[PDB]
Amino acid sequence: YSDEVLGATNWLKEKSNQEVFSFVFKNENVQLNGKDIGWNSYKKELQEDELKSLQRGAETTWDQSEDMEWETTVDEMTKKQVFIFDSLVKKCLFEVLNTKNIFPGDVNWFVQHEWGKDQGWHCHVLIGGKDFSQAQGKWWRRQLNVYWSRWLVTACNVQLTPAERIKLREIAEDNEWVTLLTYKHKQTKKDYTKCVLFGNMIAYYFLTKKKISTSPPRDGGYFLSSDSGWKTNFLKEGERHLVSKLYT
Ligand code: NI
């Protein structure tokens, strides 16, 4: 019952029923003119001050949440790419918040990097607050995908021609490398944005995942999480499970 675990549990419980959007930031493998662009081909560290600061936050979140009771053998390249994606995902969120003149402190958000059995690396984002309503979900997804595709092309470490960069930009947009949770539907039929409950989804689902400690990553595992209150960021896996247990 550390203050950190209690603090995280209370913070989430107060937001148990706050409706939020659910997004997934991802990428897909691309081959352009024989050039392979994989999930970890975005390793430029761009020298923009905010991005640098966000990347440092991801690094230290990893460092503080690392359990040294057990060894960790995640590839260095994998960690680096995840830290970079953490900074880029957040840059996208903050850019759209700016478009809407939304004060960051009026927003609840949660970010979790994972490795899916089929898709590999992806990043879940829950985000909402008083300035958010369900009808705005589609606009948010479209705007986030604009900034996501723009930053990915800037961060790509593969030498690309201008034609290739433009092609990559359009692929990341057209194939929706930012997805929005909707209710299940038919292809022809309308899709409706499906808001989720912030505290509940975090405590009962995202905090139940197993920590990735190897390369290749365990299917379904998580790398790294963070939130707008810096509450879950530094928690070790065992601490995360204690939060779920106390939340109930
Ligand atoms: Ni996932």
Side-chain angles (χ1 to χ4, degrees), residues 8-229:
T9 304
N10 287 333
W11 187 84
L12 295 168
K13 202 61 176 183
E14 291 191 354
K15 296 169 193 54
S16 61
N17 290 66
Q18 193 224 332
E19 279 187 283
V20 297
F21 297 136
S22 172
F23 299 103
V24 173
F25 285 70
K26 67 186 172 187
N27 57 28
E28 301 178 6
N29 299 321
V30 174
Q31 189 184 92
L32 300 177
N33 299 309
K35 302 173 179 183
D36 289 333
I37 308 169
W39 83 270
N40 55 8
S41 294
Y42 303 89
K43 295 188 304 299
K44 296 191 174 178
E45 290 177 67
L46 302 168
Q47 294 299 296
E48 200 265 339
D49 281 352
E50 184 181 15
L51 219 41
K52 286 175 65 60
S53 180
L54 289 168
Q55 191 187 304
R56 286 193 289 267
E59 293 162 354
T60 53
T61 292
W62 176 275
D63 294 341
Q64 304 320 300
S65 60
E66 177 172 54
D67 204 324
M68 291 172 176
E69 296 184 10
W70 298 281
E71 68 264 0
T72 327
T73 58
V74 176
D75 286 350
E76 295 308 318
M77 178 176 298
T78 293
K79 290 168 58 179
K80 172 74 71 172
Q81 181 68 93
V82 169
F83 301 156
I84 290 170
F85 283 150
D86 197 59
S87 74
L88 295 182
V89 168
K90 283 163 185 186
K91 187 77 173 174
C92 292
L93 300 172
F94 297 166
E95 282 172 324
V96 181
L97 290 177
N98 280 337
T99 300
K100 290 301 201 71
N101 300 311
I102 296 176
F103 182 89
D106 291 338
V107 185
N108 298 317
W109 56 258
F110 172 85
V111 167
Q112 178 155 302
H113 299 263
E114 301 186 341
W115 190 274
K117 181 184 181 305
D118 296 314
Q119 69 178 303
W121 171 84
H122 59 287
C123 184
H124 292 268
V125 177
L126 305 184
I127 183 164
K130 62 179 185 59
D131 305 289
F132 296 72
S133 68
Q134 184 182 316
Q136 295 175 319
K138 286 190 171 187
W139 181 95
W140 263 86
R141 191 217 64 82
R142 180 169 54 84
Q143 296 296 315
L144 289 173
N145 205 332
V146 171
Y147 291 113
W148 181 234
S149 63
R150 286 173 69 181
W151 279 110
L152 289 176
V153 170
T154 309
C156 183
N157 61 70
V158 179
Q159 181 68 36
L160 303 169
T161 69
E164 285 163 353
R165 287 192 186 273
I166 293 304
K167 178 60 177 176
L168 181 59
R169 170 79 198 280
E170 73 168 301
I171 288 172
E173 296 265 30
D174 291 339
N175 291 327
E176 296 189 351
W177 288 11
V178 180
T179 63
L180 169 72
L181 187 67
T182 57
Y183 294 88
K184 283 177 282 199
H185 64 97
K186 303 294 188 176
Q187 179 185 353
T188 301
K189 299 312 174 183
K190 176 165 188 174
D191 51 338
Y192 293 100
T193 299
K194 181 172 169 184
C195 292
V196 303
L197 298 189
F198 189 76
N200 287 350
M201 184 68 55
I202 293 165
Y204 295 137
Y205 183 65
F206 286 118
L207 294 190
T208 69
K209 304 294 185 73
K210 181 164 177 160
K211 174 83 169 281
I212 295 160
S213 62
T214 69
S215 283
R218 187 171 187 266
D219 285 332
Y222 79 96
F223 292 105
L224 188 75
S225 315
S226 57
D227 58 67
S228 51

